[PDB]
Design an enzyme around this catalytic site. Structure first.
Site, PDB file in Angstrom:
ATOM      1  N   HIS A   1      10.218  54.074  11.416  1.00  0.00           N
ATOM      2  CA  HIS A   1      10.196  54.481  10.010  1.00  0.00           C
ATOM      3  C   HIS A   1       9.416  55.770   9.760  1.00  0.00           C
ATOM      4  O   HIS A   1       9.880  56.682   9.085  1.00  0.00           O
ATOM      5  CB  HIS A   1       9.630  53.320   9.199  1.00  0.00           C
ATOM      6  N   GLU A   2       8.198  55.786  10.347  1.00  0.00           N
ATOM      7  CA  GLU A   2       7.330  56.958  10.213  1.00  0.00           C
ATOM      8  C   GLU A   2       7.870  58.227  10.836  1.00  0.00           C
ATOM      9  O   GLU A   2       7.751  59.288  10.247  1.00  0.00           O
ATOM     10  CB  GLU A   2       5.901  56.699  10.692  1.00  0.00           C
TER      11      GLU A   2
ATOM     12  N   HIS B   1      10.167  59.913   8.494  1.00  0.00           N
ATOM     13  CA  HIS B   1       9.447  60.887   7.651  1.00  0.00           C
ATOM     14  C   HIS B   1       9.126  62.223   8.313  1.00  0.00           C
ATOM     15  O   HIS B   1       9.358  63.290   7.757  1.00  0.00           O
ATOM     16  CB  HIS B   1       8.144  60.302   7.130  1.00  0.00           C
TER      17      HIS B   1
ATOM     18  N   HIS C   1      12.784  58.016   1.141  1.00  0.00           N
ATOM     19  CA  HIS C   1      13.214  56.615   1.069  1.00  0.00           C
ATOM     20  C   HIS C   1      14.602  56.363   0.561  1.00  0.00           C
ATOM     21  O   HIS C   1      15.085  57.031  -0.341  1.00  0.00           O
ATOM     22  CB  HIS C   1      12.287  55.802   0.188  1.00  0.00           C
TER      23      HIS C   1
END
Ligand SMILES: O=C(O)[C@H](Cc1c[nH]c2ccccc12)NS(=O)(=O)c1ccc(N2CCC(c3ccccc3)CC2)cc1
Ligand SMILES: [Ca+2]
Ligand SMILES: [Ca+2]
Ligand SMILES: [Ca+2]
Ligand SMILES: [Zn+2]
Ligand SMILES: [Zn+2]
Length: 168
Positions: free
Chosen positions: A119-120, A123, A129
């Site tokens: 997930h990170e 980014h 999101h």
């Protein structure tokens, strides 16, 4: 899918990463494995390649820290924010920090490092999101009953290839 405002992205396809330090919670092999599986998820759907540096400043600096740790967003003890990462760019941008007041796991029961790392890194690559409850970039943590079920949704693929394109 959603990108960051102003659509920051990397304008190069070969990225570097450095694991600057390590959590007490897992052996080093387990952490290395989790981060490299998380890198691999995005490599497969893009032209991007990552290589590891063991010294110096990489594009994506990965570290474990607690509370105040040298940026604008201190961690908050156990629970709540587990980790955060910055959008593409120089210096702190691109970096991913993990809260070592969590207990990091490789299993489906605790706070799973691989899932949070995947997930990170999303980014770090310029994805924000998603509204899709199935997407990797959905904003709320959860895990799976079976990690072997893990897959990128079409939304995540569509978003990332909108930045970098599909793989050659
Ligand atoms: O969003 C975050 O990373 C914020 C902090 C945060 C809030 N604004 C931000 C803007 C830019 C960067 C970070 C933040 N940290 S956090 O610790 O709250 C966090 C960490 C991981 C996740 N997951 C989402 C679901 C995913 C999944 C998907 C499919 C199958 C299984 C599991 C697993 C990981 C969500 C939130
Ligand atoms: Ca950086
Ligand atoms: Ca926390
Ligand atoms: Ca810890
Ligand atoms: Zn931080
Ligand atoms: Zn997020």
């Amino acid at each position: 899918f959603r990108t960051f405002p102003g659509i920051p992205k990397w304008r190069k396809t070969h990225l570097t990463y450095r694991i600057v330090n390590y959590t007490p919670d897992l052996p080093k092999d387990a952490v290395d494995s989790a981060v490299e599986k998380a890198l691999k998820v995005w490599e497969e759907v893009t032209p991007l390649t990552f290589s590891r540096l063991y010294e110096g400043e990489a594009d994506i600096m990965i570290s474990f820290a607690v509370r105040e740790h040298g940026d604008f967003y201190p961690f908050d003890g156990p629970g709540n924010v587990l980790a955060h990462a910055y959008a593409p760019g120089p210096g702190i941008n691109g970096d991913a920090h993990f809260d070592d007041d969590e207990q990091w796991t490789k299993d489906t029961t605790g706070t799973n490092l691989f899932l949070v790392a995947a997930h990170e890194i999303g980014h770090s690559l310029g994805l924000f999101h998603s509204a899709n409850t199935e997407a990797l970039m959905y904003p709320l943590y959860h895990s799976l009953t079976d990690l072997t079920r893990f897959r990128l949704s079409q939304d995540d693929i569509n978003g990332i290839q909108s930045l970098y394109g599909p793989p050659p």
